[PDB]
Amino acid sequence: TSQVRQNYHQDSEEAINRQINLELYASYVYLSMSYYFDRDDVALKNFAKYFLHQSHEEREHAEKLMKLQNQRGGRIFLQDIQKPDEDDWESGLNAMEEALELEKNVNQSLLELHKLATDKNDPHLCDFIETHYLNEQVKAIKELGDHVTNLRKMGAPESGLAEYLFDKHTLG
Amino acid sequence: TSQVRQNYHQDSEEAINRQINLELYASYVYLSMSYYFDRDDVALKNFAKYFLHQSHEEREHAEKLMKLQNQRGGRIFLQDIQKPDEDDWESGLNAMEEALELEKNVNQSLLELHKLATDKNDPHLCDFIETHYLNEQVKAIKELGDHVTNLRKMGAPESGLAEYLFDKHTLG
Amino acid sequence: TSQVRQNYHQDSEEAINRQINLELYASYVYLSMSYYFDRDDVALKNFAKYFLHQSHEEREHAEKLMKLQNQRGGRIFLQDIQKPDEDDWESGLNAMEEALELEKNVNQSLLELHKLATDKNDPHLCDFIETHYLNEQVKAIKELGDHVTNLRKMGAPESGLAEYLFDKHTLG
Amino acid sequence: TSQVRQNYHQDSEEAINRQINLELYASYVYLSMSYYFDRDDVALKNFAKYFLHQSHEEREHAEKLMKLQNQRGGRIFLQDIQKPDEDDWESGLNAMEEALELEKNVNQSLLELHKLATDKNDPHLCDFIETHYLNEQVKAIKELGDHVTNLRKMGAPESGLAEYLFDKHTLG
Amino acid sequence: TSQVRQNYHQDSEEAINRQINLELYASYVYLSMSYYFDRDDVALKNFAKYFLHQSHEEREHAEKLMKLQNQRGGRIFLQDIQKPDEDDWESGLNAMEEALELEKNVNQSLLELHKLATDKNDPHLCDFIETHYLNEQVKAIKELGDHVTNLRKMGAPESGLAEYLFDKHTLG
Amino acid sequence: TSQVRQNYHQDSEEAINRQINLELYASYVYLSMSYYFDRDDVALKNFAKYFLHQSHEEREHAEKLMKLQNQRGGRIFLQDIQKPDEDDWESGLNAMEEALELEKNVNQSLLELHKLATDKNDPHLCDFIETHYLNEQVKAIKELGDHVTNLRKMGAPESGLAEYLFDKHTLG
Ligand SMILES: [Cl-]
Ligand SMILES: [Cl-]
Ligand SMILES: [Cl-]
Ligand SMILES: [Fe+3]
Ligand SMILES: [Fe+3]
Ligand SMILES: [Fe+3]
Ligand SMILES: [Fe+3]
Ligand SMILES: [Fe+3]
Ligand SMILES: [Fe+3]
Ligand SMILES: [Mg+2]
Ligand SMILES: [Mg+2]
Ligand SMILES: [Mg+2]
Ligand SMILES: [Mg+2]
Ligand SMILES: [Mg+2]
Ligand SMILES: [Mg+2]
Ligand SMILES: [Mg+2]
Ligand SMILES: [Mg+2]
Ligand SMILES: [Mg+2]
Ligand SMILES: [Mg+2]
């Protein structure tokens, strides 16, 4: 048992390792999306930039959880980072829709983690998740929903003009 | 169901609409108080300024709740904003006493909202209320109590000199 | 009778209290419109910003009338602020049309108030209304008319691309 | 009953008085440690500086709890501040080990306080403890563990060179 | 015997340890007074600020004696810091009167310490006490006397207006 | 066939996809090493910083290859990022030795890629590898070799003083 460990359940420690892996997976999904928009046959530079930013933000999310694991005296166990579900993301609209679904899934995982920290009477961990993760997820989800809505209302994905103009005026 | 909605109970959504209305009501109470002190037969300019600031702060409180409703995928339903309970607030002391009672009532509503968010296992909403509302209410209530105490100790409301001097030295 | 009161008819006093309420109603209508455009299924952030500005400007219009009432020795009597006629504003174009109708109804009230002040031989009150309100209304009405025209010519509300682009290039 | 008091259980109020005393005790322990390292026969100036900083931080912790007691309408009852358990702290390693044990004991007290605030449905108090105390304690404990580890790995306390070099390179 | 010790009598060493405790007691008395004035039912923020400053100055007075003990090769032995004689200080005037008595009792201790240092032919210790403590005590006593006089002449403690105005104009 | 593709053999495309994966693996290995040194029972913060920098540099190396694949009209196919071979890196010296082996294995991959590009008469690809990767690998290998040498000469890993001092003076 680590000299620093106090009020930190084994189940919590295991759940934080699972969460680390999910944040790293999200970073990888966004990396894939970014470079799909960099293809010469897609060529939406501001979609590419938006998703590369999101990828680097998710890596920060993962590192902060690694820091937390060590702060509490848990032990980091890394797992393979699974490739994304697609290699071709089809369109700007579809990529936004997929991102929205990813962020809801990551939020579900975080909510389940909070419920476990609540059940184990770990207020530090509950505060960590609330302070650093839950409102980030609500903001992300809202932003992605807004983007999906605009793209749909503009006529995407069948209008290539719509996706072009959104790239310029919203993401640029 | 909104595309962004996740872990957001209908009861919570309804309670946030009620809270919006209460914050707007508080803004209106303070507006009324401000312009009572602007009367030529009351003429306490720093009481007027203090309560106008409080009115604009309460409007911000209401707008942040409207933003939250949309962030979570709830739907804003506005209701009439009821006029305050008085048209003549009698004195600087009485207005402070009434403000103290208003802020305790708004805090009770917020505490009931937090209990509902707890019961519905909505940690995001609990964090929102704690972060942005509960300590604002504790500080407000403490400040108002301090003002009531000083005004009483100085001889208000029968001493018009007391209210004059408090206006200058504490509120000015 | 207030010690400051001079040449201020009771009918004028009562009409100013009605005007205060109407300005506060207009503020509330614009607040409602603002947060409709903040919904995730509407998501036009510059429409939201535009209407939130207008909301805050109408609050200032009410506050200036409250100040006037006290300047002239009238007594403020606040009334409830009725909720707007819609909860869902349908589209950018519809909201602009509704705003245009609201501003013509507020102008009609102000013109009736000026007629009263004229009939009661109150030149200070006539000057106040002219200086601070009547050209503000003419400018607002003209701006809203211009916005309605552009949205219609662009193809709104059926073209969600029209409303998107208007949000960006006119309101942004 | 104070005019400001709302949702603040007598048990909570009593627990905050106990916590005030513990923070003041921790400040005193660190004061003692600081001046042990200032002895001519110990003479580790950066150990002395490190522990004097910690002592002044603990006094701030105590004052913030006193402020909270008054904010909520409780009444401060101070108790004697007990002298530390040692007069001679033996070594840099031993002092760090003792500090680590002190901070775990203070964290246990805070966790028990949070459980009481949870049981009494006092979300303001729970937020106060999470926001201002629990992560401060986790960081402190982690830092102290890191220092203990380095000192041990370097050969302390039997190596006086180890303690000298740690004083210079980590604490200096 | 410490390698630095020279001309430092055991009785002087022991008296310095008593003085350290007394300075830390004085710090605690002022801390208690400060937060009495922070209560919502007292609410004199400049009395609170004044006494919190004095609290921090007495901690520095203790720390300087701890430094001296080590400079001369004496050994620090800390004792418990007894709680003050009151929990409720009654009024601004009463607290000032109590402070004046505390500072005359600390001065008497210091004068007894100087007599000891004189009787043990310790000119370094006599100079230390004179340079750093005796005029500080004379200034403090004179300031407190001045504050007591003004409060009494103004009508305290029966006049809560007196204490309010003193808080503002002398302590603010 | 992409409209941009010219002189880019399928084998080269496929080898670049393998290289992307290997760079992302290297990033993950360094991330693991970093947070091993952040453990409370290891506690070498400059080893942690060093390896976290290397992690971020390997992510940039992967991103540049992804950019290249699109520049040449190849198609990115991501694969899972395998977890590192250890969870516990044992010591500063062992981690450096493991890193040195990792960088020689990445160099061997790059040299095989250059041979392929040479055999397919792809001078643009040869130049890319030389300009951006081969001297980076030589510098990295040389730096790691230098670090291994110093740690061994200092007495690592048995001397925890050696690793402490290396952390401070070379990596700090
Ligand atoms: Cl355009
Ligand atoms: Cl005065
Ligand atoms: Cl060295
Ligand atoms: Fe994330
Ligand atoms: Fe509020
Ligand atoms: Fe208006
Ligand atoms: Fe503390
Ligand atoms: Fe003193
Ligand atoms: Fe690389
Ligand atoms: Mg993001
Ligand atoms: Mg306020
Ligand atoms: Mg919180
Ligand atoms: Mg306007
Ligand atoms: Mg009504
Ligand atoms: Mg500390
Ligand atoms: Mg003093
Ligand atoms: Mg005792
Ligand atoms: Mg490198
Ligand atoms: Mg696999």
Swiss-Prot record, chains A, B, C, D, E, F:
**Essential for association with cargo receptor NCOA4, annotated site positions:** R18
CC annotations in GO: autolysosome; autophagosome; cytoplasm; cytosol; extracellular exosome; extracellular region; ferritin complex; ficolin-1-rich granule lumen
- One Pfam short name: Ferritin
InterPro entries per the UniProt record, alphabetical: Ferritin, Ferritin-like, Ferritin-like_diiron, Ferritin-like_SF, Ferritin_CS, Ferritin_DPS_dom
Tell me the compartments it is located in.
Cytoplasm; Lysosome; Cytoplasmic vesicle, Autophagosome
Expression across tissues is: Expressed in the liver.
Any single GO molecular-function term of the entry would be: ferrous iron binding
Q: What is its main location?
A: cytoplasm
For this protein, what is the EC number? Answer: 1.16.3.1
Which residue intervals define the domain Ferritin-like diiron in the entry? 6-155
Biological processes, Gene Ontology terms: immune response; intracellular iron ion homeostasis; iron ion transport; negative regulation of cell population proliferation; negative regulation of ferroptosis; negative regulation of fibroblast proliferation
UniProt KW keywords: Acetylation, Cytoplasm, Cytoplasmic vesicle, Iron, Iron storage, Lysosome, Metal-binding, Neurodegeneration, Oxidoreductase, Phosphoprotein
Please describe the quaternary structure of this protein: Oligomer of 24 subunits. There are two types of subunits: L (light) chain and H (heavy) chain. The major chain can be light or heavy, depending on the species and tissue type. In the human liver, the heavy chain is predominant. The functional molecule forms a roughly spherical shell with a diameter of 12 nm and contains a central cavity into which the insoluble mineral iron core is deposited. Interacts with NCOA4; NCOA4 promotes targeting of the iron-binding ferritin complex to autolysosomes following starvation or iron depletion.
Linked disorder?
Hemochromatosis 5: A disorder of iron metabolism characterized by iron overload. Excess iron is deposited in a variety of organs leading to their failure, and resulting in serious illnesses including cirrhosis, hepatomas, diabetes, cardiomyopathy, arthritis, and hypogonadotropic hypogonadism. Severe effects of the disease usually do not appear until after decades of progressive iron loading.
What protein is this chain from? Answer: Ferritin heavy chain
Q: Which organism is it from?
A: Homo sapiens (Human)
Q: Which gene encodes it?
A: FTH1
